[PDB]
Amino acid sequence: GSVEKLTADAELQRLKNERHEEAELERLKSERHDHDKKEAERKALEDKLADKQEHLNGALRYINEKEAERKEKEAEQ
Known part of the structure; x- marks a missing residue:
């Protein structure tokens, strides 16, 4: 037949039904709030x-740990 036409x-x-408007507005519809999600x-x-x-830092590691073992008083200091 001629159904092909x-x-x-x-x-x-159908292409007029699919559109791109809704997919374009979806981006703006987020108003960049989706960016905050990543933040x-x-x-x-x-x-x-x-x-x-x-x-x-209350692990007592920031103090003179080495001096607690050896005070190096045996040296000139």
Whole structure:
């Protein structure tokens, strides 16, 4: 038959139904709030790091550890 011609306008009409408008507006519809989601991962890096902070470094490691074993008084000092 000649259905190949008729269906060509019906298939072309499908493309008018698919559109790109909704897929383009979807991006703007986020209003860059989706970008903040990615910032939450960055914020989580500081939120955990600053929270732990090695217990304010209260491990007594920042002191004169070596001097606690040997004071080096045997030398000239």
